Amino acid sequence: FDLTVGITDPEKIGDGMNAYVAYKVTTQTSLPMFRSRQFAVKRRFSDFLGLYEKLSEKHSQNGFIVPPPPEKSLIGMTKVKVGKEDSSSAEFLEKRRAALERYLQRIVNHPTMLQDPDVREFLEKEELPRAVGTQALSGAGLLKMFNKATDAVSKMTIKMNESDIWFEEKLQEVECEEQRLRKLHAVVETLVNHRKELALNTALFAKSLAMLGSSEDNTALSRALSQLAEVEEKIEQLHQEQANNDFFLLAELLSDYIRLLAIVRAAFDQRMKTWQRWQDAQAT
Amino acid sequence: ETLVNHRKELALNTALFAKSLAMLGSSEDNTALSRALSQLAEVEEKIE
Amino acid sequence: RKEVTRFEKEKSKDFKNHVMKYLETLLHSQQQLAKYWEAFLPEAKAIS
Amino acid sequence: RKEVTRFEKEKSKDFKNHVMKYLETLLHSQQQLAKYWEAFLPEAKAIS
């Protein structure tokens, strides 16, 4: 495919907890809206997720389409229940790279909306914002929580339409789907916890083989120790690498899928708000 | 004997994984995925 | 609704991600597993 | 002390019980495992 990129070098921006890591991002993209076939941008995250939220309010006002999350930081010790940094140190940065690859693919998926060239030049250049990206100003969501009371009394007059008669089957369907995937998410991460004491238990079994194979001269048993401990460690690393990486990736997949579900809930909530805007407009 | 206790919730966890495969393989028409369900559940039970 | 068709296309895509997951699972499981089977049975002719 | 020699002989015997344990372990693991490998790869040529 025409999108050929490369993201390397998790370069830190000093000392702290969950703030900023620079990314060496080399982009060799075709399709000459990309400028010159050879760019290598250095981009720091937790700065263009604010650009993504400008994109969020932008497609709120004009009904456009945004791509998967450019996941930010302030997540290891806050807002997540919980996150670990030694597992993050390169690997959750690779999960950022996966979410960014899905970002790239679906930002190519809206090609006319990809030709909003300001944000494309924002991505393929370096003009990086400063480190003030940790604050709380979600008063817009507070006003949404205020207007939820008007939503709860107007929702029937919303429901008298016909497009939602095409739509609400997907609503109830995705409700039972989100219930059964949040339950399967929890039991999957329970297995991710389970495998760790599995691996420690079988590793200490191999160590106890090495222990109790002492004080004996049945040297075939000694070769059995020396072969069994290492093949146990092969099985250990095998189901260990499967048991983490694909399970927690499918978990991130369903998680930002739930995020996409929540923002499309908010999308037809904005459609609802503009509905009652023209409704009381024509009434008055 | 701690491993003998461990394997029981291992087996229940992976059996409920195969059951959740059978669950979430509904509401979709990608019938290769349906054959994947019908083959994966039983080979998981073989490993179990 | 065109975006709805687009994210059923990514339903196909991430179901395909689980499909290629079990594809590489069967692949690397079979090749690595049976590789040390066929590399450790000829030493287990009679050497433990 | 002759009984001591006798129960080092049963040390050899129950160590041999673990030896025949891993003997049947490698045996049934390899034959059953690789049996459904060679029985489920020809259906996984392209059928899931």
Side-chain angles (χ1 to χ4, degrees):
Chain A
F1 186 73
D2 293 327
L3 192 277
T4 60
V5 298
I7 300 103
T8 55
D9 297 331
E11 196 273 336
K12 59 100 177 180
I13 320 293
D15 186 74
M17 297 300 172
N18 298 112
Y20 290 104
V21 168
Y23 288 162
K24 176 63 172 61
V25 177
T26 301
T27 59
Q28 298 304 114
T29 310
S30 297
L31 293 175
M33 292 70 169
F34 182 79
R35 294 278 80 81
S36 66
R37 304 285 85 81
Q38 183 71 44
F39 279 163
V41 294
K42 178 66 72 173
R43 302 293 295 167
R44 289 170 64 191
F45 63 95
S46 297
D47 287 326
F48 53 87
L49 193 142
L51 190 279
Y52 178 72
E53 295 297 325
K54 191 263 289 179
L55 266 284
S56 299
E57 57 87 18
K58 187 260 290 180
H59 79 84
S60 77
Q61 81 242 2
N62 62 18
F64 288 172
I65 285 98
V66 280
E71 290 143 3
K72 59 149 198 16
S73 67
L74 195 63
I75 59 178
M77 292 180 181
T78 59
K79 197 183 287 185
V80 180
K81 297 182 291 295
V82 292
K84 187 173 75 174
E85 294 295 325
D86 186 74
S87 67
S88 179
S89 64
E91 203 278 334
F92 288 166
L93 307 175
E94 292 292 327
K95 302 288 102 174
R96 308 290 83 79
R97 290 179 179 91
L100 190 144
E101 182 65 31
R102 300 281 75 76
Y103 181 83
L104 288 173
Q105 293 303 110
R106 298 283 80 78
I107 201 176
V108 159
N109 240 49
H110 40 86
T112 61
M113 297 177 187
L114 180 59
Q115 294 302 108
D116 192 1
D118 53 357
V119 299
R120 186 175 67 247
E121 295 293 331
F122 289 162
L123 293 175
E124 69 182 2
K125 299 294 184 291
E126 297 176 356
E127 65 273 13
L128 276 301
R130 76 283 302 150
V132 297
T134 60
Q135 75 274 18
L137 45 86
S138 178
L142 271 71
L143 266 69
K144 303 300 183 292
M145 292 179 183
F146 286 118
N147 294 318
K148 191 262 182 182
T150 307
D151 303 339
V153 300
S154 181
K155 63 172 72 174
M156 284 76 73
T157 63
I158 277 85
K159 287 178 180 68
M160 70 182 178
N161 55 0
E162 195 271 332
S163 67
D164 201 4
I165 307 300
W166 182 258
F167 292 160
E168 95 281 20
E169 296 87 2
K170 304 296 187 293
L171 272 296
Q172 182 59 255
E173 194 272 337
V174 82
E175 194 273 332
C176 73
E177 288 295 331
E178 65 87 20
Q179 186 60 254
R180 80 199 192 148
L181 71 88
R182 77 121 290 263
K183 185 61 69 178
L184 185 271
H185 176 74
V187 183
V188 158
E189 298 297 324
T190 305
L191 190 272
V192 173
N193 205 163
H194 182 83
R195 75 98 196 259
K196 294 189 286 185
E197 67 265 15
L198 197 160
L200 292 174
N201 195 353
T202 61
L204 268 298
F205 280 154
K207 297 289 103 176
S208 297
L209 289 173
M211 290 174 186
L212 279 77
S214 66
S215 297
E216 58 90 18
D217 192 2
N218 195 0
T219 182
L221 185 61
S222 299
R223 274 83 55 85
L225 263 62
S226 68
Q227 190 270 134
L228 276 172
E230 55 89 15
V231 298
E232 183 270 323
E233 293 297 325
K234 296 293 177 66
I235 298 163
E236 190 271 331
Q237 59 86 30
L238 192 277
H239 71 267
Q240 191 275 128
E241 63 87 20
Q242 184 65 257
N244 58 16
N245 69 1
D246 188 77
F247 286 83
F248 67 43
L249 149 93
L250 251 295
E252 292 180 354
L253 186 146
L254 59 88
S255 297
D256 62 0
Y257 184 74
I258 290 297
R259 205 283 317 273
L260 181 62
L261 292 173
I263 66 184
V264 301
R265 297 289 83 79
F268 67 89
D269 286 331
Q270 291 300 110
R271 288 182 59 189
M272 173 268 168
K273 292 181 188 294
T274 58
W275 179 80
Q276 56 85 30
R277 281 174 185 174
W278 71 266
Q279 184 63 256
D280 64 358
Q282 61 86 30
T284 57
Chain B
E1 298 297 324
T2 305
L3 190 272
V4 173
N5 205 164
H6 182 83
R7 75 98 196 259
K8 294 189 286 185
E9 67 265 15
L10 198 160
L12 292 174
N13 195 353
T14 61
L16 268 298
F17 280 154
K19 297 289 103 176
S20 297
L21 289 173
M23 290 175 186
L24 279 77
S26 66
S27 297
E28 58 90 18
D29 192 2
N30 195 0
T31 182
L33 185 61
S34 299
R35 274 83 54 85
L37 264 62
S38 68
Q39 190 270 134
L40 276 172
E42 55 89 15
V43 298
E44 183 270 323
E45 293 297 325
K46 296 293 177 66
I47 298 163
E48 190 271 331
Chain C
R1 291 180 68 185
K2 268 74 175 176
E3 193 272 332
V4 163
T5 305
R6 201 275 311 274
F7 67 80
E8 283 110 18
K9 181 65 176 67
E10 69 87 20
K11 289 183 179 70
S12 298
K13 191 270 305 296
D14 61 3
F15 290 163
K16 182 261 294 178
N17 287 121
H18 179 72
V19 166
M20 62 84 70
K21 167 250 170 61
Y22 182 63
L23 190 273
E24 58 85 20
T25 302
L26 189 145
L27 280 178
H28 81 277
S29 300
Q30 188 172 3
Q31 67 86 30
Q32 190 269 334
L33 179 60
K35 181 71 175 178
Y36 70 85
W37 282 116
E38 67 93 21
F40 288 157
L41 180 63
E43 60 89 19
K45 298 297 181 183
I47 289 295
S48 65
Chain D
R1 291 180 68 185
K2 268 74 175 176
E3 193 272 332
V4 163
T5 305
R6 201 275 311 274
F7 67 80
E8 283 110 18
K9 181 65 176 67
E10 69 87 20
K11 289 183 179 70
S12 298
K13 191 270 305 296
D14 61 3
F15 290 164
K16 182 261 294 178
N17 287 121
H18 179 72
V19 166
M20 62 84 70
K21 167 250 170 61
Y22 182 63
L23 190 273
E24 58 85 20
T25 302
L26 189 145
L27 280 178
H28 81 277
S29 300
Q30 188 172 3
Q31 67 86 30
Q32 190 269 334
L33 179 60
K35 181 71 175 178
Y36 70 85
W37 282 116
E38 67 93 21
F40 288 157
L41 180 63
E43 60 89 19
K45 298 297 182 183
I47 289 295
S48 65

